[PDB]
Design a protein around this ligand. Structure first.
Ligand SMILES: Nc1ncnc2c1ncn2[C@@H]1O[C@H](COP(=O)(O)OP(=O)(O)O)[C@@H](O)[C@H]1O
Lengths: 54, 53, 53, 53, 51, 53, 53, 54, 54, 54, 53
């Protein structure tokens, strides 16, 4: 239990340091760009299955 | 050393691990029935009222 | 947020109520029964949020 | 006669092979699409999931 | 090399989102039934009403 | 942009609305469902854009 | 006559072994599924359980 | 048995120390993370099972 | 039995390391390319037997 | 005979060790591989036999 | 804080009682017994909590 609790404290602290350092507006912007990239890749994939159907 | 004996040895292991998980759940405090039976009875009378109207 | 969750779940319960009655009207008992169970489940979730609110 | 029946059997094998490869190509592309769909779903689950950066 | 293992990797990755299929399955079925069914009726009554 | 999307679907709804009434003005039976369904889908999308707007 | 009598005996035994191997490979897949399910069940019951620190 | 009791006292002190080091804000959130990380893995097992049934 | 079991464990672990390292999409793509190459070789072979028949 | 019994204990311990080192996922699959690798060879013998009969 | 757990064990006891009743109304003489036992345990706990409060 001692080291299991220790691990939880350490991971919590490390994740908080990450949460602190990052700026969620820049990350949210970057994230939307990445979602848009994935959307384009799915559009291409959809076009390919339509092409095979045809 | 045969393939089948290795297969049977791992098969028995897997079956024991399933049984262990089952038993662990029962010891922890089973809760995948007492709620199902209630939901069933409640939806039962709900179906009757819906069908009636 | 709790207010929003409460309202949203209530609205989902009504949508499944409508689906149950439509299934019943079509003559498919099983989907009506299941839909009324889903209606109850969403009502129960909404209820929990109501108390929480 | 021997060459014609030999060639015929070989032609049948060629047709079967080609049909199976055509199938494989079709299945490969729909798997690529489903993989990319899953990846897209994951990015929305991330951005529009819980809390974090 | 397996096409099936490629399927299994996809099956795994496209699952966390919760795809038991209790939701989608039921929904689509009844929807399409009464939806297109209602479209037939509507269309045919409009075709024999508004003239 | 939300206004424009709403309006665009309204225009597209009228394009399929005339085709639905046309099949119904010829005492046809199985054409109407196609145009009516398309119009219905577009007005549901417009509804969502209305809420958004 | 000797060749035919012996080559037919071998075919019966090959057929039996083919039934045997395929039995194991379909079991292999479902057992791996059962094992993964059991492993996961045990971990969630322990983690969501309040026992321990 | 005095040895074991000394060990008990030491573990108790260390347990209290790591409990005191917790910050509810970080740790409660970290606990939820663990719940979700565990759930994902079980979903993947159920994913396989459903495929095998099919 | 000891070393026979040892061998089975070692081969299983080695094959798992291979399964882990490889990406089955790239391999499936490569595999389809190789099947297409074999298909062309069989087409040529078929043409040759047709040529001899003729 | 105490020598043989000591050897028994050592083999038993090593047997238990290699059993514990098994992971069903890898090993069950590996076992199937061995079955298929063996079957291929028998098919090649039956292949020859059929040719000789012809 | 003590008062809180007291009052909450009370509600849990009432829930278990109602579940026992509902089970007895559906012809299940097994679930109701365990539910009554759980209620008894929680009521003992509530008693002790009341005393210490
Ligand atoms: N506080 C949080 N709440 C929810 N998700 C979080 C949080 N912090 C990080 N996450 C990330 O979001 C994901 C949530 O897990 P997931 O299983 O998708 O949620 P759910 O179980 O509700 O579907 C995790 O993979 C995790 O990396």
């Amino acid at each position: 239990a001692l080291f299991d609790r220790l691990g939880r404290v350490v991971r919590a602290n490390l994740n908080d340091l990450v949460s602190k350092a990052e700026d969620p507006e820049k990350v949210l912007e970057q994230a939307v760009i990445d979602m848009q990239e994935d959307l384009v890749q799915l559009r291409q994939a959809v076009a390919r299955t339509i092409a095979e159907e045809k | 050393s045969s393939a089948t004996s290795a297969f049977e040895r791992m098969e028995n292991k897997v079956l024991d691990m399933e049984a262990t998980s089952q038993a662990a759940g029962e010891l922890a405090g089973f809760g995948i029935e007492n709620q199902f039976a209630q939901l069933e009875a409640s939806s039962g009378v709900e179906d009757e009222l819906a069908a009636l109207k | 947020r709790t207010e929003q969750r409460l309202n949203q779940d209530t609205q989902e319960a009504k949508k499944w109520e409508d689906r149950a009655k439509l299934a019943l009207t079509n003559g498919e008992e099983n989907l009506a029964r299941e839909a009324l169970a889903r209606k109850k489940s969403l009502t129960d979730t909404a209820a929990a949020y109501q108390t929480q609110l | 006669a021997q060459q014609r029946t030999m060639s015929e059997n070989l032609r049948r094998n060629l047709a079967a092979l080609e049909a199976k490869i055509s199938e494989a190509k079709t299945k490969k592309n729909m798997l690529q699409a489903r993989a990319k769909a899953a990846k897209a779903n994951a990015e929305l689950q991330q951005t529009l999931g819980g809390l974090g950066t």
